[PDB]
Amino acid sequence: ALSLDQRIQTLAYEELNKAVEYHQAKAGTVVVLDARTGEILALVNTPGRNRAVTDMIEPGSAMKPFTIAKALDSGKVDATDTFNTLPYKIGSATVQDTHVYPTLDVRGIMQKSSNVGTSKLSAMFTPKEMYDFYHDLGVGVRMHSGFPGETAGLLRSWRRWQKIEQATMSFGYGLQLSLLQLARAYTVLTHDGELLPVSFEKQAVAPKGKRVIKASTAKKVRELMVSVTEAGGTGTAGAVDGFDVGAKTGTARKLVNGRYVDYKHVATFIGFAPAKNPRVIVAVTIDEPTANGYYSGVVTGPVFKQVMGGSLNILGVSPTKPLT
Numbered sequence: 001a002l003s004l005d006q007r008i009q010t011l012a013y014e015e016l017n018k019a020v021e022y023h024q025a026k027a028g029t030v031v032v033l034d035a036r037t038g039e040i041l042a043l044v045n046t047p048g049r050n051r052a053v054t055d056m057i058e059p060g061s062a063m064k065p066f067t068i069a070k071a072l073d074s075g076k077v078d079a080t081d082t083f084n085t086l087p088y089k090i091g092s093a094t095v096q097d098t099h100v101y102p103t104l105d106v107r108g109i110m111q112k113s114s115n116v117g118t119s120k121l122s123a124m125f126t127p128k129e130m131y132d133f134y135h136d137l138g139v140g141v142r143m144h145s146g147f148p149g150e151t152a153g154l155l156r157s158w159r160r161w162q163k164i165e166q167a168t169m170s171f172g173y174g175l176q177l178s179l180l181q182l183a184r185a186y187t188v189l190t191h192d193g194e195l196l197p198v199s200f201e202k203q204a205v206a207p208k209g210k211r212v213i214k215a216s217t218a219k220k221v222r223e224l225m226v227s228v229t230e231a232g233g234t235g236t237a238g239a240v241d242g243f244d245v246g247a248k249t250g251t252a253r254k255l256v257n258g259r260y261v262d263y264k265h266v267a268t269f270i271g272f273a274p275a276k277n278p279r280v281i282v283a284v285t286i287d288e289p290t291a292n293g294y295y296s297g298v299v300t301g302p303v304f305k306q307v308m309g310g311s312l313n314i315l316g317v318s319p320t321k322p323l324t
């Protein structure tokens, strides 16, 4: 028997289709995982191939929690540390944020989705340390999910990284993974620091997780990620009534012919709830919205909200706070 929950599958399908229609987008996908087992509760794509497993995207800002996790886990950074987040150069490349903040603490880097702050965290580590961490999250690794045509994604050897590439990989460019790989990587945060295998079969034995970060680090990162869905974060459209939700938005210019183009984007929204003791991960991507807005928050945040909210209801998880 499949691990798929048909009521979640139905909800995800309807919500995805509504958003793809409304935003006149090219394509999209939803993955729902069990946060403590890695079982696939739902996996839906717009018509055609199984893009969730076959296609690789650059994660963009959806990678930033991992860079933050690695920093905190090393003991070298505390969440209250403040960083200079002004634009700066690497060789003759510029790292800069959409909206300039002079300084941000780690909570701020998460909340506001700072490229500069993320790159400063990664710059405390060597290429080999960062590569090993991305590898350990499963980037460029086969999941062996049972799906045919499953991509391993792309993680170039650290032996060939330029300094700019370390920076850009820390905020999610130059490495690639499927939506299912990206949802899987979030089990590190939900399953107390251990990466889980993904499966579409009902589990019979407790899955063997592989330790990537300390449980204390995973807990802290989940707490920081609630900032994304509260006032001041990029991801308030994904807030769910009655729960605290940890999430990350991602808005990427689309890589098309080796070029990154400024008039095509890919919107990603990934999160988990309840944030303190999560039951589910929901990941959403919509490719090339064209109806006006293209930011993750407006395009994918409402599908995340409805699928997460509906999923928690279906699985019989009580709200942790009064509905409003």
Ligand SMILES: *[B@@]1([O])OC2=C(C([O])=O)[C]=[C][C]=C2[C][C]1[N]C(=O)[C]([N]C(=O)N1[C][C]N([C][C])C(=O)C1=O)C1=[C][C]=C(P([O])([O])=O)[C]=[C]1
Binding pocket: 060, 061, 062, 098, 113, 115, 168, 173, 174, 234, 249, 250, 251, 252, 253, 254, 260, 262, 263, 295, 296, 297
């Ligand atoms: B990230 O996705 O977080 C966000 C979000 C969000 O949280 O939803 C919204 C807006 C900006 C950002 C910053 C993060 N994304 C970006 O920085 C985007 N960057 C890129 O697409 N690229 C392409 C490739 N390279 C070289 C490898 C880059 O350095 C790079 O940064 C981004 C997103 C939107 C824009 P636009 O079109 O609105 O100007 C530009 C860049």
